[PDB]
Design a protein around this ligand. Sequence first.
Ligand SMILES: CN(C)Cc1cccc(Nc2ncc(Cl)c(-c3csc(C(=O)NN4CCOCC4)c3)n2)c1
Length: 333
Amino acid sequence: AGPEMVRGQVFDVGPRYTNLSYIGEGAYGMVCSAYDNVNKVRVAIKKISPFEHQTYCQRTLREIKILLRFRHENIIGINDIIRAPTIEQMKDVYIVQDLMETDLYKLLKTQHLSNDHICYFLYQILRGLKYIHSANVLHRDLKPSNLLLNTTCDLKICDFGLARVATRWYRAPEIMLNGYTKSIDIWSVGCILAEMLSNRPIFPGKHYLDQLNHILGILGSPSQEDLNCIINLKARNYLLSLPHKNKVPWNRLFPNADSKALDLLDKMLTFNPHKRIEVEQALAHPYLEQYYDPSDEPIAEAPFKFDMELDDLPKEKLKELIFEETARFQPGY
Ligand SMILES: CN(C)Cc1cccc(Nc2ncc(Cl)c(-c3csc(C(=O)NN4CCOCC4)c3)n2)c1
């Protein structure tokens, strides 16, 4: 019996992995669960087909190298990698990882979170993000659909394809001019907090202009100091063209949320990245006092550093590096 297929997509991961089930898909990849007939468990498998585009090749190499170096309870790992025995044959790369029960996206579509769970999930997101930022890496695309949850309420951050060393509903406002710094991740976590408090996106713009209006609709018109953070000229001009907007207090939007939760949300969703809170201070905020435990919150031993200029490399070079990096999982290595 030939190779497995999932929604007309071949999934050439047997004989070890079988009984595939669709989970989701991105721009150049698909995710399924499968049965691992060695460890007698179900696993997650992300198929990645990036080699047509230099950008996809950089993100794939970055994703693999970062996830193989990171070792943290709140961050998805890589257990196995499958690809063809020769570089000429390699069209796809399959990354095998721990299977989780669901993601925060789906959870928030069907469940109301107690203040306790919101607190505990927020702690874990930030605890993972502390490890991440401690290594001088940015995730850059945190969102409910890549925060994974287990039966026992354990959370893991996944999809590091966009990560870099230091929808669009979670993009910080600095980015909607563009400057990727650690504070864009805190913005995303702020938006995630809001969504956990209400079950609806806080800034659900149809496009970037419409997202800016949502943001200003709650934060109010930016100050002049805040306007000096907005480097891009079209954006700055646009902001200067708008009528004044008043700041809406957080407890009017979330009338039944914990006061501490709202005080932290306020500091995470701050227009000016320079004044936005940082991950350790977030973790030490009173709202999180029930879980904050710096004695058991690991950081990376050293800053992550790429020794090559991936941006500069032609997609053929990248593919060779991807062949190299995945060698160690190939039989007979
Ligand atoms: C419906 N039934 C399947 C339940 C369910 C629902 C969602 C998740 C999981 N479990 C799980 N376990 C391990 C992993 Cl590794 C992943 C995973 C999902 S997506 C992804 C990634 O890399 N995704 N990117 C592309 C898609 O958009 C987001 C980013 C990794 N999921 C189970």
